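worker-03 picked up job from queue 'complexes'. Input manifest follows; two sequence lines, order preserved.
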Amino acid sequence: SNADHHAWHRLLDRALSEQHFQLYFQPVVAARDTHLVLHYKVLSRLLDEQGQTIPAGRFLPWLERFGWTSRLDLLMLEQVLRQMASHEDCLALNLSAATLADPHALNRVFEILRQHSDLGPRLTLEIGEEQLPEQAMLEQLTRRLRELGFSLSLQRFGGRFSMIGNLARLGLAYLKIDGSYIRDIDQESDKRLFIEAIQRAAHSIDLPLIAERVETEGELQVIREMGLYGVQGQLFGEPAPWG
Amino acid sequence: SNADHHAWHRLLDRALSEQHFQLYFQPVVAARDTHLVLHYKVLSRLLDEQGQTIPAGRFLPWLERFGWTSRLDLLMLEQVLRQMASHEDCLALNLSAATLADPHALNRVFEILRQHSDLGPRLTLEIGEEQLPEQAMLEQLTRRLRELGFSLSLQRFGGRFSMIGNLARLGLAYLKIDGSYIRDIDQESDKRLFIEAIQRAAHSIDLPLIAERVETEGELQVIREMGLYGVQGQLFGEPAPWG
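worker-03 finished. Artifact:
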């Protein structure tokens, strides 16, 4: 694969520099009524010669090996902020540990955000739990974002529940729960006790909860019945260009 | 270290076959009154020529590399059950993933337990969360132990909180919380929110909670104030032969 590295490498580099990434939008909706959307998660895709889509699951890895993940983040950031002037809907954008660990990258982000202060309300940046900063830089990060008027969320949440307490300082916009803790909850009640604990803690600190990766009407009903704020997943069609 | 392997190897093998392990007892006590003991955790030590002690932290690793961890478990088991006839106090014994993954080992354990049915009430076997069996074998395990009249506990608990729900089926005697979630709780309030969630879930299923590794009077007070059942740690002297 000495070569494959070259193929992908020569691929992504040009995609970063030429803006070959397409903007795709996954609806995140209300558990109580899935016809109500809360905001749209923003996804990045690539188009093959045929026009077919290429998911990040197939190219992120390559971005990681090359250490260009920051490089993307920013392309999406600017590209999105640009997209957002055409409308007045709420968006959620992905942020990568790669971009956070790199001081130069952040500062870039803040420089960008500064140019688009008017879109603070409508843009929530999401970072993953799995790949998360130390306590100190995290509180700093939210401060920097509060000053600029932007919201921060966590996703893939659930494994670092132990840290639930430090989240209050912050003022996260919401908490997106890893869909693994929700999978077949309809037929595996042992899973609900965990969720409850979350709600009782989240509710406690006025943090809304969104259920990630809901794939079946069964899971939807119990989430609805347990009263979580939000829901997203395959169960609501595929993501898609801005229609 | 090609040699060190031989040194330790020729060491432990003889200790397993000759019974060179010494029985040591760490008191686990009531949070509300540390003069009340609930049971004694059982520890295994080795004696150097001088008489000084040798903690498992220094020999377990070697036992792992050689795959003799099961081999020990059973030595302790029998040795302990033997110790227990001389008294009427409650004991807690360590059980290793190594022994659980090995069908032959278990069966040995059950064969041993069968010979000492009269000591069911007084012996609680503890297994760690970190190193834990799949769901199916776990429920089977407790069944096998219920039939024989012995109690099971979890320790190092907290990281796999997500599994809290499946614990009800079981009938664990107690839940021993990893002392990492308790460290400087006196001065780090962000830690208490996590504990609360635990209590509200544990209490929910009538599972008592014990705080592992309490090292300071500060930690003790907040645990006491939050109302956890049990406490153990360096703060209550060193372990020791049966006095």
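worker-03 released lock.
Chain A touches chain B through 23 residues (CB under 8 Å).
The longest helix of chain A spans residues 2-18.
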